[PDB]
Design a protein around this ligand. Structure first.
Ligand SMILES: N#Cc1ccc2c(Oc3ccccc3OCCn3ccc(=O)[nH]c3=O)cc(F)cc2c1
Ligand SMILES: [Mg+2]
Lengths: 395, 527
């Protein structure tokens, strides 16, 4: 009910960021929505004395258009304001959208000028409509940090009632972990929702994927060459990998399709390598100070692979993604959904989003990613233009 | 007196830590001084400025050319920060269109009182025997940094209610002008224009052109639009600036004019081709063409053609033979590339431009087979997408020139290749051995490892049948070939491409070097 003073970092000016072009329907939706928000005092029009601008577009979570603000620049420019590690160990986790509460808290008068945004016009026929936020905006990192106390006071009775449930909060989203059954889980979620009114993920079903080698009765030259390549790659990750006895088989010049019988030394070496690969990775730790890096590779046929790490050849997590919903004919949609899922998992495990390395040209991604994006937050990303040789090694 | 509706000022501050500008007044002739005295006198009579005293330390230099010229560059440097032209092809056809340019634009809008202290200037007296005459602005000065923003914001603020009350008309606003338009009758339209002038007059804004309109390098006619005539400077000596200006003019012409090429002239800013290019440009600029306006009820179509040498051209239209606009796309700087990627980029560009201009993505007509694109995007390691499109056959067609096998080929000879070079002497060797006994090693002067591995692969391609397997230890060569260029800067790579095109089936395997993998010989090229 009272505004807590908010400032910026030591010497960082407020965000000035170009608004990117929007289609006509999205502009309409934003006009209607922002009119309704203007009527409710949530935002207010501003003049030219405000230099600052933050990007804004429109999505669909539901056929109702939602307003999304790209608060990345503002978040990194906003001054710096207890991760429940038992959240990733829970049987099930459900995510809720508690953003609707953020608009009940007034914002510090001095900081509003930094939350300025522009609804753009087609063909620049008229000046864009500029607004500023009067309340806590969704997408800002300061909003959950400010509403944290209120959220605590609201969620106190539910937490004291049954402490088998973990509750975490990230941005506009509220994560709830439990060990119950899906039906009882949904009734519990209904009771929690109506508990918030008065005021489906499975973390246990993910793992860290091992490196597997083929089991064959007969090996071709090509098979063994791929095997030696893969093991040579794995040598960077594991200490005791050796390939000299397998390479010993490849000696001489032979056709790729010719079958080469394994020796006893080769089979022994291969087995030793298997035993080595069955072990976890040596000395893999998480550093809360460093940055999380997510790499994604396109495997084709809806298949995508990914690795989250901090130092090269030291994976904090690895996973696959073959989920198909209406995405069959579109690569970019697939990549967008994949990036979203990976970011969510990262939020659950470490309480923060990673930096992505997308196997896509900058122009394509920049053009189309906002069409398929259903998430209230946004991560950081970069683009890898050189094809990785290691693709099939993660396949 | 009917009271004028008050215009609420916009609060203005300087940059933090900075103070207002202080600059000594320049010596002026007597005529200049008299002229400035008269001008400032009548301006003071009108109420645009006011006389001040010694209490103001800030001084802004002034000249006379009459007409007063106040130089606020220092004030502009010390004043705070304040918050794209409409494209003719995006405009919608209206039975009537009226232009209204408000006179005394900046001088009709009041200035924030607490900032007037900083716009102070001094008129030098005659013979400097008496203190100079002091003045300060009460409205937006000409040449001040914050004038246009405040002006246009005030303008919008006043314009909102009339626009809301009249949905049957469309109003555009650029800077100091208003462009109204409607499909009403002439009398009704002219009447509503009079009403608008009255509404603006209520707030104290004075307003008065007829087609064709000469606007921002464009010519706007009722049923069509074009560009103002392009003049290509003719001189036997072309300087860097001349080439920059020519490139700018040709780029500006390329929106309406199809087939404009600027690759050579832009390449000279880092021949017979260039002269023939510019001559063809003069050939296109011979008979002028007109673009049409936009109709929301009809589909939006963009058609693309390969112009050759990394150059692409596109036409955006709704009906055949009648273009909304046109354009071109030059390939990005790169060592390798193929037609499909460049086409994709071009599509992206056209898409963004389209969303800017019409607020929608057009349907595409592309010179590529559905099958080709299918193969491409399905096998390409990067993620890639194009919006809705159909195949139009207008050669040259974009195609995939070669495709690498996913698996080793049976009955096909297996070429184990390798190349190496000495760093200091730049001496190297490149060659291959196969399972049928076929060998070759070639020595090379002036080369590197990469060049010799590429050369080895090329050798394998030259001396092999229609189907071949190839083993290499080079991550470099495999890296280049897995990018699938159909053209390259390096002649060797182009030759390898030329070889691949002739092949039926090619499988390209990779192994780690120096692992003692048989058939792979680093020992032949190390000598
Ligand atoms: N000088 C000048 C200038 C003049 C007019 C401009 C302009 O007319 C319009 C303003 C509002 C609605 C529609 C308009 O035009 C559509 C196309 N169009 C043009 C001329 C004509 O005679 N008829 C017709 O249909 C729009 C604009 F964006 C800039 C304009 C600039
Ligand atoms: Mg080599």
């Amino acid at each position: 009910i009272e505004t807590v003073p908010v400032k910026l970092k030591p010497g960082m000016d407020g965000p000035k960021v170009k608004q990117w072009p929007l289609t006509e329907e999205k502009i309409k939706a934003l006009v209607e929505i922002c009119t309704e928000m203007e009527k409710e005092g949530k935002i207010s029009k501003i003049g030219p004395e405000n230099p600052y601008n933050t990007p804004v577009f429109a999505i669909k979570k539901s056929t109702k258009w939602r307003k999304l603000v790209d608060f990345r620049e503002l978040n990194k420019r906003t001054q710096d304001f207890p991760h429940p590690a038992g959240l990733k160990k829970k049987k099930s986790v459900t995510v809720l959208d508690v953003g609707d509460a953020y608009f009940s808290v007034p914002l510090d008068e001095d900081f509003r000028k930094y939350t300025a945004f522009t609804i753009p016009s087609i063909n620049n026929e008229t000046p864009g409509i500029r607004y500023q936020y009067n309340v806590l905006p969704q997408g800002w990192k300061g909003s959950p940090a400010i509403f944290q106390s209120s959220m605590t006071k609201i969620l106190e009775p539910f937490k004291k009632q049954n402490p088998d449930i973990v509750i975490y909060q990230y941005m506009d989203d509220l994560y709830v972990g439990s060990d119950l059954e899906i039906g009882q889980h949904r009734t519990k979620i209904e009771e929690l929702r109506q508990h918030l009114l008065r005021w489906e993920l499975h973390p246990d079903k993910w793992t860290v994927q091992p490196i597997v080698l083929p089991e064959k009765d007969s090996w071709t030259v090509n098979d063994i060459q791929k095997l030696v390549g893969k093991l040579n790659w794995a040598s960077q990750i594991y200490p005791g990998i050796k390939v000299r006895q397998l390479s010993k088989l490849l000696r001489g010049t032979k056709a790729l399709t010719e079958v080469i019988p394994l020796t006893e030394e080769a089979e022994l070496e291969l087995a030793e390598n298997r035993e080595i690969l069955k072990e976890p990775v040596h000395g893999v730790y998480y550093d809360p100070s460093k940055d999380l890096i997510a790499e994604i590779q396109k495997q084709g046929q809806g298949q995508w692979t990914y690795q989250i790490y901090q130092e090269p050849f030291k994976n904090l997590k690895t996973g696959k993604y073959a989920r198909m919903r209406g995405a069959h004919t579109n690569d970019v949609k697939q990549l967008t959904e994949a990036v979203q899922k990976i970011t969510t998992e990262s939020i659950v495990i470490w309480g923060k989003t990673p930096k992505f390395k997308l196997p896509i040209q900058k122009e394509t991604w920049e053009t189309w990613w906002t069409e398929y994006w259903q998430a209230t937050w946004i991560p950081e990303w970069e683009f890898v233009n050189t094809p990785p040789l290691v693709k099939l090694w993660y396949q | 007196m009917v009271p004028i509706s008050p215009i609420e000022t916009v609060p203005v501050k300087l940059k933090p830590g900075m103070d207002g500008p202080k600059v000594k007044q320049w010596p002026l002739t007597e005529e200049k001084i008299k002229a400035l005295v008269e001008i400032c006198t009548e301006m003071e009579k009108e109420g645009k400025i006011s006389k001040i005293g010694p209490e103001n330390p800030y001084n802004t230099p002034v000249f006379a050319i009459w007409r007063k010229l106040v130089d606020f560059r220092e004030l502009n440097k010390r004043t705070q920060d304040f918050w794209g032209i409409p494209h003719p092809a995006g405009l919608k056809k209206n039975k009537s269109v009226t232009v209204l340019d408000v006179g005394d634009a900046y001088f009709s809008v009041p200035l924030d009182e607490d900032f007037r202290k900083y716009t102070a200037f001094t008129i030098p007296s005659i013979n400097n025997e008496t203190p100079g005459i002091r003045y300060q602005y009460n409205v937006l000065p000409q040449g001040w940094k914050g004038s246009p923003a405040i002006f246009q914001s005030s303008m919008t603020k006043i314009l909102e209610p009339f626009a809301a009350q009249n949905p049957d008309i469309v109003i555009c606003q650029y800077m100091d002008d208003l462009y109204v338009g409607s499909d009403l009758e002439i009398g009704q339209h002219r009447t509503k224009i009079e009403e608008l002038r009255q509404h603006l007059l209520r707030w104290g804004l004075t307003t008065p052109k007829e087609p064709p309109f000469l606007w921002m390098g464009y010519e706007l006619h009722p049923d069509k639009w074009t560009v103002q005539p392009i003049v290509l400077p003719e001189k036997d000596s072309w300087t860097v600036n001349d080439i920059q200006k020519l490139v700018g003019k040709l780029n500006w012409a390329s929106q309406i004019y199809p087939g404009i090429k600027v690759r050579q002239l832009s390449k000279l800013l880092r021949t017979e081709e260039a002269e023939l290019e510019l001559a063809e440009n003069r050939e296109i600029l011979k008979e002028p063409v007109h673009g049409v306006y936009y109709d929301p009820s009809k589909d939006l179509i963009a058609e693309i053609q390969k112009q050759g040498q990394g150059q692409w051209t596109y036409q955006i239209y709704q009906e055949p033979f009648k273009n909304l606009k046109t354009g071109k796309y030059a390939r990005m700087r790169g060592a390798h590339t193929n037609d499909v990627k460049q086409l994709t980029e071009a599509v992206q560009k056209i898409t963004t431009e389209s969303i800017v201009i019409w607020g929608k993505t057009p349907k595409f007509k592309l010179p590529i087979q559905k099958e080709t694109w299918e193969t491409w995007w399905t096998e390409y390691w990067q993620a890639t997408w194009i919006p809705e499109w159909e195949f139009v056959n207008t050669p040259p067609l974009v195609k995939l020139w070669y495709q690498l096998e996913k698996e080793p080929i049976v009955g096909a000879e297996t070429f184990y290749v390798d190349g190496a070079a000495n760093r200091e002497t730049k001496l190297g060797k490149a060659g291959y051995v196969t399972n049928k006994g076929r060998q070759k090693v070639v020595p090379l002067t002036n080369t590197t490892n990469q060049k010799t591995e590429l050369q080895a692969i090329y050798l394998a391609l030259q001396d092999s049948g229609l189907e071949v397997n190839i083993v290499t230890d080079s991550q470099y060569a495999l890296g280049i070939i897995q990018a699938q260029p159909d053209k390259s800067e390096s002649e060797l790579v182009n030759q390898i491409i030329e070889q691949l095109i002739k092949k039926e089936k090619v499988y390209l395997a990779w192994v780690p070097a120096h692992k003692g993998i048989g058939g792979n010989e680093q020992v032949d090229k190390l000598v």
